[PDB]
Design a protein around this ligand. Structure first.
Ligand SMILES: *[C@@H]1O[C@H](CO)[C@@H](O)[C@H](O)[C@H]1NC(C)=O
Ligand SMILES: [Ca+2]
Length: 476
């Protein structure tokens, strides 16, 4: 599916080993500190598609599918998929090629997309970089395919960032020489044939900043689908330029101020407001970035704060911001693991309740986004406009005049006082009826064009014209 196809999507990102087992167990041991395979599979995902689609997601992103180093390393098993050795075999832990095709087919049958995580930067190897036997890599079964062994000493030297090896002498990450035509042609042939064989709709490309920029356009073209890159840098001046060599990047620029705004009742609404405007103006296309606050490479939101209202606001922002919402499996069950490996909790241990606070908030926010997009072909290309901030509030508008969603977020948290926000800049007409679609109440725009938004419990508010909901299932 194309970048234009992907603008309307909403992604549930999951770790294949940690989402769902073939047997459907909700009690099977998964001690994150063990760093071992817990037994999640592609067939498990299929079994739990009702749970995902119930939150209004239109797509999933699964961790990589390639065969991994076989060892239990000092850092555990390759349960996460980022230590590949044989790119022409699947990781048999998750199932067979027929299971991965069944997953693709099962999503397509529900009108959903499959995104697959891929790494071009490196292979994985158990032990020191000086110990690597290159014959274990397929097809790259020679040291000739690899950069000379060195570690990044200076993260400000982009040549070192690209040409030296990630990892360490515990688990080494042999760095492919992606400047060689032989390595480009291998990878390009591979990714086109992966996408074709499994009917994949999009890719998440990990590790993008560690591969020189001139590699990426031919890879993205060979894939023939929307590719969203991981460029792990909060500076839009570093990260944004990568969207000129690949369709999208993950929104690490928004990540930091978004986390900081909502993780604390003292979080900066200014830094978030300013980064929204910086990305909107400066990044090649904010509507093709991936919005997130939680993944397997950072502490979970609830590891910073267990305040449920703060979690509800940050989830509402992710769904209603420019670009593709991305929620990480467990975020909807308020998982609180810190850094790796604590943030790779098994989703099944929650028992997959569909009546949890954040399951319902995500379902409501995805419902209004999916509905608004179905009625407004301009929603996805209207760049989100921050219209208001104060010390505890940000309000934003997205969508064609007459059809705009106006979202008011707060960091007051669950002990926030009851009060009325007189919101200007919404652009609704005096006297129009709005539905607050989270709480399913009505608000009427003033004669003066200001919106009197009831604020309570630090809860997010999401406004949309009542007449435009006619015949919809929203707030039945
Ligand atoms: C896709 O299937 C074709 C036909 O067998 C094969 O040549 C190719 O290597 C496969 N690609 C992947 C990555 O499975
Ligand atoms: Ca590299």
């Amino acid at each position: 599916a194309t970048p234009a196809d992907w603008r309307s999507q909403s992604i549930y990102f999951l770790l294949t080993d940690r989402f769902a087992r073939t047997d459907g167990s909700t009690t099977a041991t998964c001690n994150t500190a063990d760093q071992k395979y817990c037994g999640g599979t592609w067939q498990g995902i299929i079994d739990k598609l009702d749970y995902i689609q119930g939150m209004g997601f239109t797509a999933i992103w699964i961790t990589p599918v390639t065969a991994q180093l076989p060892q239990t390393t000092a850092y555990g098993d390759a349960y996460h998929g980022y230590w590949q050795q044989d790119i022409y075999s699947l990781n048999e832990n998750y199932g067979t090629a027929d299971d991965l095709k069944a997953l693709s087919s099962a999503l397509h049958e529900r009108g959903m997309y499959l995104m697959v995580d891929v790494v071009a930067n490196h292979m994985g190897y158990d032990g020191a970089g000086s110990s690597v036997d290159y014959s274990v890599f397929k097809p790259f079964s020679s040291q000739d395919y690899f950069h000379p062994f060195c570690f990044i000493q200076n993260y400000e030297d982009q040549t070192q960032v690209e040409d030296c090896w990630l990892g360490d002498n515990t688990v080494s990450l042999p760095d492919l020489d992606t400047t060689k035509d032989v390595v480009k042609n291998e990878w390009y042939d591979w990714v086109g044939s992966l996408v074709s064989n499994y009917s994949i709709d999009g890719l998440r490309i990990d590790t993008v900043k560690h591969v020189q920029k001139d590699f990426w356009p031919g890879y993205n073209k060979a894939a023939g689908v929307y590719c969203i890159g991981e460029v792990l840098d909060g500076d839009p001046a570093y990260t944004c330029p990568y969207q000129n060599v690949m369709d999208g990047v993950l929104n690490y620029p928004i990540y930091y101020p978004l986390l900081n705004a909502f993780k604390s009742t003292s979080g900066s609404m200014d830094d978030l407001y300013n980064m929204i405007n910086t990305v909107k103006s400066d990044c090649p296309d904010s509507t093709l970035l991936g919005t997130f606050v939680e993944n397997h490479d950072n502490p979970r939101f609830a590891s910073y704060t267990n305040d449920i209202a703060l979690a509800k606001n940050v989830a509402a922002f992710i769904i209603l911001n420019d670009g593709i919402p991305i929620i990480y499996a467990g975020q909807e069950q308020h998982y609180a693991g810190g850094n790796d490996p604590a943030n790779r909790e098994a989703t099944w241990l929650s028992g997959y309740p569909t009546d949890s606070e954040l399951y319902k908030l995500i379902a409501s926010a995805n419902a209004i986004r999916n509905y608004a997009i179905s009625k407004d072909t301009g929603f996805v290309t209207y760049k989100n406009w921050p219209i208001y901030k104060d010390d505890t509030t940000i309000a934003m508008r997205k969508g064609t005049d007459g059809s705009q969603i106006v979202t008011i977020l707060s960091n007051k948290g669950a002990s926030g006082d009851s009060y009325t926000l007189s919101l200007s800049g919404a652009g609704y007409t005096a006297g129009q009826q709005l539905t607050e679609v989270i709480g399913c109440t009505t608000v009427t725009v003033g004669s003066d064009g200001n919106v009197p938004v009831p604020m309570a419990g630090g809860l997010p508010r999401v406004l949309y014209p009542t007449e435009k909901l006619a015949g919809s299932k929203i707030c039945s």
